[PDB]
Amino acid sequence: MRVRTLDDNGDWTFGRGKADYITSKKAIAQTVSTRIKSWANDNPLAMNANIDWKDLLGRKGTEDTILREIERVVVQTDGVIRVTELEVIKTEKRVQSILLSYDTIYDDSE
Template identity: 50%
Template sequence: MIVSALDKNSDWSFGRGRQNYITGGGAIAQKVKCRIRSFKNDNPLNMGDNIDWVYLLSEKNTEQEILREIERVTLATDGVMRIVQLAMVVNKTTREQGIEMRIETVFDEQTINFPISGALKDGTTV
């Protein structure tokens, strides 16, 4: 699998030719992260794909449902063999949430960590 690499701001990186592409387990991990961040009904070719974040983040006590949806989307990603570890870290005081996941791909084992709080400290949305 070959995908265009994302920079630290989750934007596509350009200007370095083939060095802007990643392969192997890193590519699969990036694809999983992008699919988890994608909203349900955003892809006209597959409306049921991805996660209904609007509903899940607007309701109370949906942690287990969020984890099930993340598991469903992750295991449906090409190249993912299994989920080794999946956890949600919740800070109820600041209302920040984060996903910590370790997956086994056809190439190697990858760790994925990212916030799902809706906004980062610098004001950008997730």
């Protein structure tokens, strides 16, 4: 799978066609990285685009469902196999940071 690369801050890239495209194992990385970031009832063309944030960060007691939905999004991605993810800090102020690790379809060629 190809996909246009995004630069550091994550804006789009035009020019260098066929070269601003991520090849693989990093295309999966980019595609998971910003599949997580796709609020659900945003896109009128995909209203279940990805997990529903306005209804999960605005309600108490969803950490388990945040994690289950992140695993859902990641696993249902073209190119990933497994996941290994949990929470690493405990809302250091009130923001919790979770650690997400997944095995792409690559690095399994032995």
